Subunit: 177 residues, 2 copies
Amino acid sequence: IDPVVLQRRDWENPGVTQLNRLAAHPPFASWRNSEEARTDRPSQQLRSLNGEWRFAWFPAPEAVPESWLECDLPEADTVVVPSNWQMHGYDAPIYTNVTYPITVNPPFVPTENPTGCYSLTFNVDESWLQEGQTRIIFDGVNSAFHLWCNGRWVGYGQDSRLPSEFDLSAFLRAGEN
Amino acid sequence: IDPVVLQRRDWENPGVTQLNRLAAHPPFASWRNSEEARTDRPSQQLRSLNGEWRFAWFPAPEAVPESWLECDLPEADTVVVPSNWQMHGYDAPIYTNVTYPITVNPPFVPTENPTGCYSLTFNVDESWLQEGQTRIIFDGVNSAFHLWCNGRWVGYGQDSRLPSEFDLSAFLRAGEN
Ligand SMILES: [Mg+2]
Ligand SMILES: [Mg+2]
């Protein structure tokens, strides 16, 4: 995968902690019924994309083949999301206390940078696209990520412990995405 | 010019105020003689690049031809630097008090964005490149700029009223640059 994304190396620049990320806010559900809001019941406007996803491990972002942007890699596995890929055995989890698990050379990280390629094919109803705004919410991604929707680059996010949100309204189509 | 530079539009993103810019610091001259430092005499290690530069005006960054990176544009004039290009008559200076001179739509600016293409051919001695670090210092560039050296992209800067500095050690060659 290329070109601006690999050349710009946003994950080695503390001046770039996000690209195209929406403003942070308190928890939303966008109820269209007041009584459902009052009683804190599920909202039709808030969908979980949790469940079975496609996943492939790579030793570095340079190793990621371009075709992955367009379609599923045959060598990928089907895995549960949310998950830490170390818990599925793709590489080792590391326990260190104080000493960084990487060479201390800010803002640089090792060239061998384990890379998790997650993908999902899913439906979007036309009602969601005729009007209004459809965003995706990643509550936790460790430690940084680039996002594509239907082959098009959407954005980038950092901070493993807060939600990253991106407007997908111009990226989605009715049916399979 | 292209591809990552025009695609990223760093001049319409308050999250990117510089790329590859060096840390700010008090005025340096790197004297190699202490008596010279004491008397505040000129330093052979601090060279002015003020004087005659080549300049061309464009209505937008998109209209800048790729060739300008590699070689001088025949249509470019020879102008004095430092200068404001309005004072040379290339476009009009604007006096507004409170109301912004552009449509208030942060972080966006008009697609018609007057662009000043400056170039300089200059000598660097081998003594400068065999040892140590050679930086360029721009004390004031209004309002934002990309920098190339011998065709290769160096970095980007904002804030019109403070110096932007860049390491050219790896971009320069002995003789003409
Ligand atoms: Mg970064
Ligand atoms: Mg900017």
